[PDB]
Amino acid sequence: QTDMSRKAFVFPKESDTSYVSLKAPLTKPLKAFTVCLHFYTELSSTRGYSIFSYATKRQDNEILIFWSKDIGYSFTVGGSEILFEVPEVTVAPVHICTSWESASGIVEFWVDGKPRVRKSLKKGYTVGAEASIILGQEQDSFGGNFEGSQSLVGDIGNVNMWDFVLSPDEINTIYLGGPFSPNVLNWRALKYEVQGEVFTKPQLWP
Amino acid sequence: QTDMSRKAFVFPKESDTSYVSLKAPLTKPLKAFTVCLHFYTELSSTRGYSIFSYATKRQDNEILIFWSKDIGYSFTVGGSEILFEVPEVTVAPVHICTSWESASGIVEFWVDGKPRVRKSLKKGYTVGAEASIILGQEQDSFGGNFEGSQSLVGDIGNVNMWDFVLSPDEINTIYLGGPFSPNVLNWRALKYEVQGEVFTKPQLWP
Amino acid sequence: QTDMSRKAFVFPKESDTSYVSLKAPLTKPLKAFTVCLHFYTELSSTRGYSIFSYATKRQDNEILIFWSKDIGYSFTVGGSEILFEVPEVTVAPVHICTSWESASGIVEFWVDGKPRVRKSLKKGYTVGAEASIILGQEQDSFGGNFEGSQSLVGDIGNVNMWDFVLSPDEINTIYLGGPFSPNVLNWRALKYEVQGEVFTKPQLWP
Amino acid sequence: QTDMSRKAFVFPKESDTSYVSLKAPLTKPLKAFTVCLHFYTELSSTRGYSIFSYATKRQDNEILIFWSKDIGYSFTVGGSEILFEVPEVTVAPVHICTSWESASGIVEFWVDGKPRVRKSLKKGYTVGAEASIILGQEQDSFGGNFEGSQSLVGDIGNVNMWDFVLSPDEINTIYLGGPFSPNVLNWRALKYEVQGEVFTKPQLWP
Amino acid sequence: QTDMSRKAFVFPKESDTSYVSLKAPLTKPLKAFTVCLHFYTELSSTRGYSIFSYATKRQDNEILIFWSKDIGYSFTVGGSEILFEVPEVTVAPVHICTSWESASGIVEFWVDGKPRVRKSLKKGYTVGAEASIILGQEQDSFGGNFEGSQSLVGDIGNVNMWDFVLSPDEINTIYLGGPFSPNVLNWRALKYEVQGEVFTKPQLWP
Amino acid sequence: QTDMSRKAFVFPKESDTSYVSLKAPLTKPLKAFTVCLHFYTELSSTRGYSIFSYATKRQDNEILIFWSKDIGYSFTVGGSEILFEVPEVTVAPVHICTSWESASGIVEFWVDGKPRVRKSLKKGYTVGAEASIILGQEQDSFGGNFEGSQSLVGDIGNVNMWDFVLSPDEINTIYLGGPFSPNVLNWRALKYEVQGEVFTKPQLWP
Amino acid sequence: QTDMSRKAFVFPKESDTSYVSLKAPLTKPLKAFTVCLHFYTELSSTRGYSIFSYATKRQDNEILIFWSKDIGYSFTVGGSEILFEVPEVTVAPVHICTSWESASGIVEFWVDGKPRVRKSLKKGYTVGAEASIILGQEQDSFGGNFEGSQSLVGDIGNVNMWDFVLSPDEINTIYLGGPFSPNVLNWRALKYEVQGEVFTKPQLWP
Amino acid sequence: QTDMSRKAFVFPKESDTSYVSLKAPLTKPLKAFTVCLHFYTELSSTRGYSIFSYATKRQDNEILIFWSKDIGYSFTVGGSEILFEVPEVTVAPVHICTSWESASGIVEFWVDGKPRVRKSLKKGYTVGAEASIILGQEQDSFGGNFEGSQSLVGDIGNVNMWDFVLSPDEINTIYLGGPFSPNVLNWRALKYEVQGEVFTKPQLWP
Amino acid sequence: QTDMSRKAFVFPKESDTSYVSLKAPLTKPLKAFTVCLHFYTELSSTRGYSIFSYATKRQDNEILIFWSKDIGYSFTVGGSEILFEVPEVTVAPVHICTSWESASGIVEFWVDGKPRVRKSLKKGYTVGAEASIILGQEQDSFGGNFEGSQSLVGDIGNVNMWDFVLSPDEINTIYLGGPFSPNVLNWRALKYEVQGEVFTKPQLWP
Ligand SMILES: [Ca+2]
Ligand SMILES: [Ca+2]
Ligand SMILES: [Ca+2]
Ligand SMILES: [Ca+2]
Ligand SMILES: [Ca+2]
Ligand SMILES: [Ca+2]
Ligand SMILES: [Ca+2]
Ligand SMILES: [Ca+2]
Ligand SMILES: [Ca+2]
Ligand SMILES: [Ca+2]
Ligand SMILES: [Ca+2]
Ligand SMILES: [Ca+2]
Ligand SMILES: [Ca+2]
Ligand SMILES: [Ca+2]
Ligand SMILES: [Ca+2]
Ligand SMILES: [Ca+2]
Ligand SMILES: [Ca+2]
Ligand SMILES: [Ca+2]
């Protein structure tokens, strides 16, 4: 097993082929999820980029967190999308957590430990468990059809996924970094393979 | 009576049907009141929304705390309005306390523990005791005739009401959430009825 | 004598009839003085207003502390006037101390414990003891001829006066709320007469 | 959960009743750890005292940091003790960090950013996760059997725990106060209960 | 008031008659205080002496800061005592602050800007407001019964008293002589009476 | 000589006659100096003003610290000038230190304890000791020819002059007001002559 | 060797001739380096300037750290360049660390202890060992052809160089003034020739 | 060959089996050598220990750097011993360099960059090339017959060996750490075999 | 008169005949004085020696500064004596200032710029102005009867006398050698006569 503790994937150039693919142990479909990660990029002013691409064979945008230029975070489940407008962006490593509960469709979006207002999305939908989870690229087909103009350039790490909505107090722990253990996707117990020009480096963020 | 502590009502979509109705065990018509609440919504940039609607058969806007777009807090008692103009509104959870006394008609409006200047309103009025207290909607009938364009979207919680003007010292403790005991309307002992899509979730705020 | 400690005069409407007259014991002409007060008004958004009027039978602006629109504090003694041009004004209680010495005419203006540059005004003048001290109105005759366009709206309190120039240390103890003994006009021992709609309420400012 | 930054627990009298109990919801057993803390006491010449007591139900001294009078720091894991002799200790706040690695049993003790020599302890052992973590007292049973002659008298704070061995350059960051993310026990995000006479005060140490 | 700034009471010879009485405008009974002062004396290697003696009519040792031969500072409140043992003493001006809080009885003793360990004393007591404050002597009645063997011989100055516990940040400013405003007993505005052989000299200590 | 501690010269009106002349007990020509002073003036946005005018019969601008409108500080030695442009000036008391060394011509300028970049001026020059040092005016003869447009209005004090370049650590303590001994011009021991409307007052800055 | 600790090279004038040449007997060609330094200059808003110019006989820009006007830090290795655009330059002493690893070509750029995003440069290149390191000038031939329009004006110090990439924790140690051991270029152990008008002065920066 | 940069060998237990054997590519008999190393041990006050054991087939103490209890560093070549008395020894890592020259027998012994007095040992002797270099043990045969009472308990690292006398200037760089290239035994490029309980850890010294 | 600046009298040999006698332009009997001088001698562990001897026809010990072996500085006025005990003397040049005031009897004694505690002596006495000042001998008659066992051996210089008590500030400048103007006895303007073996030499102290 690989323990990524204090290590981040570095995607130091724009390309369509540098990416890492993550394997979840998940088999049953998701009635809820929380995903959290650190990322650090310069792109935000220049262009949009894919942060986190979760594609099932039914749907290439089954979970997508997308920075949209001059807009903010696009959050999409099942191809349906909502925006958390971010009007001023700062060159610092940013930590996000995003939780989606099917039963109500409530999306919480958390940036550096601050919550966004709970929006509604895709109430009653079910996320498929058979997924190609890709970091560094946007996939428009199951595990493929990357576009360089949507690649992440820079750092991504601490990528953790839960099959349930974390409470606010939990998320405070994640941000400050107290003890936690994910069950869908564990940074400390990460099954992954790396394709293209991708490096593991010490994380820049504490 | 439910201890709603740590929990908030989530109004995740614009609708004309999602509201919670709060039941006051209130006998005497109000010579004075204090209402305090947290809310968190992004609409402030976008449109007006009803924070707190208190209606009676003779008067639908018997108390209205209303965000008016690009203006700030409308405060109404008995159909008469005053404004606490807010030139710029943070996308953060806002705690407001508002207190009105019939003998003087002084309104104190408090935002996040900071007092606005006292303003006169409706000296010698007397607020009807038998009232429809609606969260999430503005109301024009006794308990209905809502408007989608004025529904709150996002969170409302810690809704406490006193039949008297708290001194500044109490209002400090409320903003701290220190030891206090409402008597008209107690979040720790809320009697309420929920209609439409309204969800009770962990509050996003201290 | 009334101990006004912790209490403020509230002028919640503009009128030319609401004023509180302060009775000084002073019988000997002032060759120097200091006047400190807390006030709270949003009128700065709107118009000029009298903070503090001190009229003698001869001269109605014997001491005037006046907010001049787009300018700031207009300090005039014996009808002659100086500006402390204030670049930016905010919705906060403001504590001012202003002291004048005949022997040199040095005016010191202190705002929230920050000194303005010393200016000379009316060197060699002498201020008459037989005066009418009015809060809430600018005063153009010994007890009257008020203008609504110049009234105070909101809060005035801690109105203390000395017949000598306080030192910088002494002023710091006023602002930080230490012990002091005003010998002309004592908030803790105020002889005063409310007229019209003026209220005594707890000071909003700590 | 409370942010304890800048604050310390004060245990101002010898007793067996005053303690604070820290919650670490660890799931996986600790194969390695680092614990760092600030403490301030004058007992060091009078008697021994428990700095940091970690107890499992099988083992009450599962991690103990103990000052042995006229000896120095006692570091025990799984009930076996090693001494870091300290021929004199001054009346000053002392920052200690101690790391233990199962894979080697190397114990690394740091006092005010100076390492002691590395020593071997409990090579191949494993520390149980379900534990009672106590400040101010020494445990002789899980969560209890405190003994006044072993209580801390004085201050303890900045209690941070990692489930891995910090490198020497990381420990300098802690000592110098650079940013860090404790993965087990986070002072910024501390979950605790207080029992008996214990107070939260501003830290005396920088 | 006298501005004592940079001036010290010199008690150059042993006597039982020479003392300074300090008048505090104090009427509320003190739930907490800070005493800070400079003193300079040879006696420390020879006999005990009163540093700072505060008496009420019911208690001659209401607050006492006493040097005890071969022991150190004795801090006593309401007649109950604790020792801050000073193992070895040198001939230099020493700046002390002492803080006491009723709500916990924590005594903070500060020597030249270094904190002693927090100790417990007289929790829940209250210090009487009507007091005789004497420098140079230890009083056993309200203002008398001095003893020559307990008199201070040497320099005392910068006697500042607060009715509240200064935070450590503050106290550093004190010891640096940063801007500070004592609200109970202020050097820069000292109301005092001298009896016998006490001289006002330039302070030796910077 | 006078100890001017905690006192400032006040130049409360614009004139050409009000100035104070400071006498340097100096006989040997200066190969280096440090001059530090506090001043407080509104003029900064209106017009230029002389801060510190040092003239000799050879050279009326032998040292000139001069505010040039919208430029900032002019520092001139021997009539040759360098600028420390200050793009925004604010109404606050400002402490400057300026240092000149002949052996290198390095000018250190310091504002409120922050150093400007070292610039070179007048390498190898030597400054005459027989000088008229005038505050409040720019002198264009040895001791006269003032210009009202160049007078200081406001306050100047703590003028301390050294015949050597203070190290940065020294200049730090000055700004803190640690103990220091200026050997050319000492505010604790100032010999001065006051001409016209100039007052000694308590200094407004801390 | 000379210990430059606490000392900076001052380049107080624009010149083509003022430089210091630093000697490293670097034997092995660099597959990695870190260079860290403090510099202080006002030119940032005026024009570009060379910070750190390292040349080999084959390549005049073998390592160059260059401020480029209204853009920021030009980092080039082997004549290939990347930009860390800086939109808004404080005039304050700035600490930078830059590291380059051949194996990846990852450039880390750190400004006042905060990392820029990692960028790719010259993957697989090797930096020549026989090199001339110039402070104060940009060199276009192995040891000359300096352009005064590119000279640094201001301070350079703490110039430490490692032949390997420092971890983030090592860089926090450098910036916080912790203990470090440079294996290529050592301010504590610096061997250099001053040429032209360069002075050694105490550093203006902590 | 391994780069042991920033790593140390750790001997955390007293044993006669834990050692590392260093394989010098030494082709020729040594007329001169320098050996420099960092080591860190408590034993110095307890008992003697081998630092650096060089044995040829002919001579088991061909070079031995030995801490003999209460004396200090025993330096012996060819079985002939000189003592550098170290009367006070401390718990700090100690960097030693030691050089011996056949042509003169002058031994330079350097402790933390301080030279001991030069001493004569074994003039004209010639050290054999066929040598077992052992760290952690003192060998009485070629590669064997260790004694647990002479083992190093603690850290050793930066083992660099030159077949020539380093000048003092070189030694300085060694101690501070600038660029150097050893030709007999290179820590940057080390061939070593590990026997028993020996660990490689991050070095504790900077 | 001779400017003796930078020069000291050297008394290289014990004798009862070597002295320098200093002539005071002093006529009014001293109500107060300060004397400051540098001396350097190794006798302090051998025997007592006269530092400074002031005689009148009526009183040979009118002012005596005397080192009394194992005690310290004997200071006597009118034959009344106080000791400033020195715990351990050091072999270095020492600067003392000692000052006396009749009106209070207070003695200030300064050693190397550090004040001793003020001690009372001879209050209300007056020192005779018709005086013989001798350096190098203790005089038991008006200008004679010296004792070799009391002679100074070594150096004395910078002997300055004021008819008044210098402030602490002033004494600092002395010790630093800032500009100062003695009015009783001026080393820059010295009248002296020399008998026996005394030499003028460059001063050893800085
Ligand atoms: Ca897609
Ligand atoms: Ca795409
Ligand atoms: Ca309505
Ligand atoms: Ca409506
Ligand atoms: Ca008028
Ligand atoms: Ca009017
Ligand atoms: Ca136990
Ligand atoms: Ca026990
Ligand atoms: Ca007593
Ligand atoms: Ca007594
Ligand atoms: Ca001019
Ligand atoms: Ca001029
Ligand atoms: Ca070039
Ligand atoms: Ca060039
Ligand atoms: Ca052997
Ligand atoms: Ca052996
Ligand atoms: Ca005698
Ligand atoms: Ca004699």
Numbering used by the authors:
A (entry chain J), B (entry chain I), C (entry chain H), D (entry chain A), E (entry chain B), F (entry chain G), ...: 1 to 206
Quote the authors verbatim.
C-reactive protein (CRP) is a pentameric protein of 115 kDa composed of five identical non-covalently associated pentraxin domains. The B-face binds to a range of ligands, with the canonical example being phosphocholine (PCh) head groups in lipids such as phosphatidylcholine. This is a calcium-dependent interaction, with each CRP monomer chelating two adjacent Ca2+ ions. The A-face modulates many effector functions of CRP, such as activation of the classical complement pathway, where binding of complement component C1q to CRP is mediated via predominantly electrostatic interactions between the Ca2+-containing globular head domain of C1q (gC1q) and the A-face of CRP.
Decameric CRP is formed from the offset stacking of two pentamers via their A-faces. Intermolecular contacts between monomers within CRP decamers were also dominated by non-covalent ionic bonds, which formed a second ionic zipper, perpendicular to that found in CRP pentamers. Ionic bonds included Asp163(chain A)–Arg188(J), Glu170(A)–Arg6(J), Arg188(E)–Asp163(F), Arg188(B)–Asp169(H) and Asn172(C)–Ser181(G). Although decamers appeared to adopt C2 symmetry, they were solved without symmetry applied and reached resolutions of 3.3 – 2.8 Å. No major differences were observed between the decamers at different pHs, with or without PCh, other than the proportions of decamers to pentamers. Intermonomeric ionic bonds found in decameric CRP at both pH 7.5 and pH 5 were similar to the crystal structures and the cryoEM-derived pentameric CRP at pH 7.5, except for at Glu197-Lys123 where there was a larger distribution of bond lengths, indicating conformational flexibility at this location. The proportions of these varied between conditions, with pH 5 containing more decamers than at pH 7.5, 68% vs 44% decamers, respectively. No crystallization is required for cryoEM using single-particle analysis, hence these decamers represent solution-phase structures of CRP, previously posited based on analytical ultracentrifugation (AUC). Residues implicated in C1 binding and/or complement activation are predominantly located on the A-face, and therefore binding of C1q to CRP will be sterically hindered by decamerization, which could inhibit complement activation by CRP at low pH.
